[PDB]
């Protein structure tokens, strides 16, 4: 009775990532891939079953995205790609996914609240669905032809649409959920083909049920499962859900659904859902206790599990209890056993995909007999050491009794009271010019001062000679990733070697690991900033990476709250800001692009996030002279519904991912607001190699002089500049203060 909701699809060494690019660029027959893909599938099925894995998912693979695999199942393939019909393949899957030369790909978004991205279905009243992608059914026969019988994981009809989006044209008054009966048969055709394939169980992921559907939307679910009951005759169905706890209503509608004989809840992030089952439950259905994190990287507290996993036996037990992972072990890493650089003591404190597969099986076993007491002894030990090893609990739990000690608004001063100061002790003209954060390279190698400043100084002599430029920027050369960097300079901050995660396409990321109560005993920036602000006579702004962002983009421990760790990571910051303070530097820019990314799916749960999230940003400079001028960064174009928190951060100047949105919607910083401060909406989108006309920025800004103010304005880019080339970046900025100097004439 062991189930695993999903699994990674790139390799224990990122194979698919490369077999994709080999292919992608024209360096391998479309068979090299398949010889590859198949060589992976074969391993996972095999490696999963060999462990005792009961339900082994089939169709969790994907050359690109689960949601696209679905879009291909119904032949929803867009119109700009030119699809006539037939069994889709490569040319059209990636065409849509990556965009070919002549016509662009399809917009991508987040897989709920995870750091993965999916391909948003582009639907409407004119798309003609077609059963044009037998991936599902094929991979089943494959694995089967390999000795193992698998479970056909699939995306839920309704959920598919909910997550879908109606592309251009379609009148606004359209019901994106009206396609239900048009797509519901193409769903049938599948079912029956697999039914007749040899399948005994099947899986339907419907995570949206863990969102907030109003009474009307919920229904959608029913009207669609009462249409399948016929097709699902004498065949168990397992509807999946994850990343949250399901609301009474949603819980009801679900546990009552027609045709479904088993349900699975992410009981790691939704342990409230239990209370609704304790209260009421269906007949003798199946319960897939999803207690094995497929989100983080630590060995599931066996003891606990087995205790709760037991508690459930009480709700059922008549043989319908099944151990399962919480979410998909796709969102985690792969095989922990590709880690050595990490001292053993710690790998004992982890477990990645591969490890998790087993995890499910030892609790699977131990809850039925054969219990390798050699795991729980080893387990409770893995535990033992963590909740004790002085590497964990530190005298860093120092600045806490001094934390609950009131918030930390910046030394009062109704900003416009300090702004005056930040003028005398820092001059400047109207609309002071500046940039965003990083810059391009040259040859590069991978002493270090004879080659260090070498460029740090050219950036200097270039940022100066360049149309003057009131305020300047250093250029983060002495780093790698704004996050990767600061890491190895804080306490509970270890790093991994092979533990990778996907973030769309071949693209993958290796988020740092937070172990013990974080802390920066030693200085981290200082001279690197005083390096430049010693050469120039113009405002040199520092460079910090908010405690919000940092925290988010990383595997954060499971022994205490997100905020608690979060804040500590904010304390160390105040150490640095206060250093560019005493270190001289008058201006210190701080960024929090990864601000929104923490929003808890359950809306009523939001307000709290924005709590410790923003308070924390303040807990960075709540000890700064009324002369120091801090700027902040947020990579959002339309944060209209999160203006408050943005106004509560209390900053003298900021920046955002403006440039490609509205100049009239900017009048959102006043009506019922009135920010009274400085804002630098990136008038010019850096993410584009194509330089804009200097005749497009004067007005862009002249549309800001209207909806915004002129006695408080700034000049800068959309986002950072660590991708743009070099001949497309020089004849570029050489046209930014220009469109400003103008209007000043009066």
Residues annotated in a binding site for L-methionine: 436-438, 476, 591
Q: What is the nearest approach in angstroms of Zn ion to the Cβ of residue 476? A: 12
Spatial distance between the Cα atoms of 407 and 60, rounded to a whole number of angstroms = 46
Helix (H) / strand (E) element for 73: namely: helix 66-73
Nearer to Zn ion, 92 or 719 (CB): 719
| Nearer CB in complex with Zn ion: 227/718 | 718
| Shortest Å distance, C-beta 242 to Zn ion | 30
DSSP string, 176-187: TTTTHHHHHHHH
Instruction: Report the residue number, 96 or 635, with the smaller CB distance to Zn ion.
Output: 635
- Could you write out the DSSP letters of every residue in 252-301? HHHHT-SS--EEEE-TTT-TTHHHHHHH---SS-EEEEEEE-SSS-S---
Site mask for Zn ion (CB under 5 A), range 672-711, x = bound: ----------------------------------------
Size of residue set near Zn ion by CB under 5 A: 4
Task: Quote the least distance from Cβ 602 to Zn ion, whole Å.
Answer: 21
Choose, by CB under 5 A, the member of 720, 735, 737, 739 that binds Zn ion.
Answer: 720
**Tokens 């290796």 found at:** 510
Query: Rounded to an integer, what distance in angstroms lies between the CA atom of residue 503 and that of residue 206?
Result: 21
Other beta carbons less than 10 A from residue 396's beta carbon? 18
Tell me how far apart the alpha carbons of residues 280 and 686 are, in angstroms, rounded to a whole number: 54
* Angle value at C-alpha 454, between 453 and 460, nearest 5 degrees: 70
What is the number of the residue whose Cβ is closest to Zn ion?
A: 719
Give least dist CB 436 to Zn ion, A.
6
The reply to whether 687 belongs to the active site is yes
User: Where does this chain touch Zn ion (CB under 5 A) — which range of 452-460, 507-515, 518-526, 712-720?
Assistant: 712-720
CB of 158 or CB of 651, closer to Zn ion: 651
3-class DSSP state of 200: coil
Q: Which stretch binds Zn ion (CB under 5 A): 199-207, 303-311, 330-338, 629-637?
A: 629-637
* Three-state SS at 473: strand
Closest distance of CB 593 from Zn ion, Å: 5
| Three-state secondary structure call for residue 384 | helix
Q: Where are the alpha helices (DSSP H) in 443-561?
A: 453-465, 482-487, 527-530, 547-552
Q: Name the CA radius of gyration of the chain, rounded.
A: 28
CB nearer to Zn ion: pick between 209 and 635: 635
362 part of the interface to Zn ion, by CB under 5 A: no
DSSP assignment of 425-445 = TS---SS-B---S----SS--
The owner of tokens 């991708």 is: 723
Kindly tell me which of 232 and 635 has the beta carbon lying closer to Zn ion.
635
Q: Where are the alpha helices (DSSP H) in 624-709?
A: 643-648, 694-702, 704-707
Q: Which of 409, 474, 638, 687 is catalytic?
A: 687
Site string for Zn ion, 637-656 (x = CB under 5 A): -----------x--------
**Could you tell me whether strands 262-265 and 236-240 are parallel, antiparallel, or unpaired per DSSP bridges?**
parallel
- The 415-444 site mask, x for binding Zn ion (CB under 5 A), equals ------------------------------
The binding site for 5-methyltetrahydropteroyltri-L-glutamate comprises 17, 115, 507-508, 553
> For residues 542 and 720, which CB has a smaller minimum distance to Zn ion in the complex?
720
The DSSP bridge partners found for residue 2 are 323
Q: Closest approach of Cβ 614 to Zn ion, in Å?
A: 8
Shortest Cβ distance from residue 474 to Zn ion (Å)? 16
**719 sits near Zn ion (criterion: CB under 5 A):** yes
Binding flag, residue 330, Zn ion (CB under 5 A): no
Q: Which residues bind Zn ion (CB under 5 A)?
A: 635, 648, 719-720
Residues serving a catalytic function are 687
């Amino acid at each position: 009775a062991s189930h695993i909701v999903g699994y990674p699809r790139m390799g224990p060494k990122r194979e698919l990532k490369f077999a994709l690019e080999s292919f992608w660029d024209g360096k391998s027959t479309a068979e090299d891939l398949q010889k590859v893909s198949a060589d992976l599938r074969s391993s996972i099925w095999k490696q999963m079953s060999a462990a005792g894995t009961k339900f082994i998912p089939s169709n969790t693979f994907a050359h690109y995205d689960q949601v696209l695999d679905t879009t291909a199942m119904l032949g929803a393939v867009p119109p700009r790609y030119g699809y006539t019909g037939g069994e889709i393949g490569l040319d059209v899957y990636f065409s849509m996914a990556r965009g070919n030369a002549s016509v662009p790909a399809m917009e991508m978004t987040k897989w709920f609240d995870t750091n993965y991205h999916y391909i948003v279905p582009e639907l409407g009243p004119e798309v003609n669905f077609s059963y044009a992608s037998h991936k599902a059914v094929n991979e089943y026969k494959e694995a089967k032809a390999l000795g193992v019988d698998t479970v056909p994981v699939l995306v839920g009809p309704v959920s598919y649409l909910l997550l879908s989006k109606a592309a251009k044209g379609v009148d606004k008054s359209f019901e994106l959920l009206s396609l239900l009966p048009k797509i519901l048969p193409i769903y049938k055709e599948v079912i029956t083909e697999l039914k007749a394939a040899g399948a005994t169980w099947i899986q339907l992921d419907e995570p949206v049920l863990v969102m907030d559907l109003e009474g009307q939307k919920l229904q959608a679910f029913t009207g669609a499962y009462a249409e399948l009951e016929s097709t699902l005759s004498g065949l168990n169905v397992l509807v999946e859900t994850y990343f949250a706890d399901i609301p009474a209503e949603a819980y009801k509608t679900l546990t009552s659904l027609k045709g479904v004989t088993a349900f699975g809840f992410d009981l790691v992030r939704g342990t409230k859902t239990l209370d609704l089952v304790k209260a009421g439950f269906p007949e003798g259905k199946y319960l897939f206790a999803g207690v094995v994190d497929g989100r983080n990287i630590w060995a599931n507290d066996f003891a606990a599990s087995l205790s709760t996993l037991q508690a459930l036996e009480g709700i059922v037990g008549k043989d319908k209890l099944v151990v399962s992972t919480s979410c998909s072990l796709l969102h985690t890493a792969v095989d922990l056993i590709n880690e050595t650089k990490l001292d053993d003591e710690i790998k004992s404190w982890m477990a990645f995909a591969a490890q998790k597969v087993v995890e499910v099986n030892a609790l699977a076993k131990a809850l039925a007999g054969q219990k390798d007491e050699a795991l729980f002894s080893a387990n409770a030990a893995a535990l033992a050491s963590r909740r004790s090893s002085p590497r964990v609990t530190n005298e860093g739990v120092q600045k806490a009794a001094a934390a609950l000690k009131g918030s930390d608004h910046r030394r009062a001063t109704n900003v416009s009271a300090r702004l005056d100061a930040q003028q005398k002790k820092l001059n400047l003209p109207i609309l002071p010019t500046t940039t965003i954060g990083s810059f391009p390279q040259t040859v590069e190698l991978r002493e270090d001062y004879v080659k260090a400043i070498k460029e740090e100084i050219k950036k200097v002599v270039d940022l100066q000679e360049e149309l003057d430029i009131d305020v300047l920027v250093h250029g983060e050369p002495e780093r790698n990733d704004m996050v990767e960097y600061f890491g190895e300079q804080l306490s509970g901050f270890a790093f991994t070697a092979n533990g990778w995660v996907q973030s769309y396409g071949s693209r993958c990321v290796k988020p740092p690991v937070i172990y013990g109560d974080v802390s920066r005993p030693k200085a981290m920036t200082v001279f690197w900033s005083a390096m430049a602000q010693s050469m120039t006579s113009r405002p040199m702004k520092g460079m910090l990476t908010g405690p919000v962002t940092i925290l988010n983009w990383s595997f954060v421990r499971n022994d205490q709250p997100r905020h608690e760790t979060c804040y500590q990571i904010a304390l160390a910051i105040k150490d640095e800001v206060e250093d560019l303070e005493k270190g001289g530097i008058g201006v210190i820019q701080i960024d929090e692009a990864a601000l929104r990314e923490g929003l808890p799916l359950r809306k009523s749960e939001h307000a709290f996030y924005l709590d410790w999230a923003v308070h924390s940003f303040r807990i960075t400079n709540c000890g700064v002279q009324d002369s120091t001028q801090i700027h902040t960064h947020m990579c959002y174009s339309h944060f209209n519904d999160i203006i408050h928190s943005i106004i509560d951060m209390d900053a003298d100047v900021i920046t955002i991912e403006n440039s490609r949105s509205d100049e009239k919607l900017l009048s959102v910083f006043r009506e019922g607001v009135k920010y009274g401060a400085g804002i630098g909406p990136g008038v010019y989108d850096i993410h584009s190699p194509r330089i804009p006309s200097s005749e497009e920025i004067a007005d862009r800004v002249n549309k800001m002089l209207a909806v915004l103010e002129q006695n408080i304005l700034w000049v800068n880019p959309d986002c950072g500049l660590k991708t743009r080339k070099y001949t497309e970046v020089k004849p570029a900025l050489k046209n930014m203060v220009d469109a400003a100097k103008l209007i000043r004439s009066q």
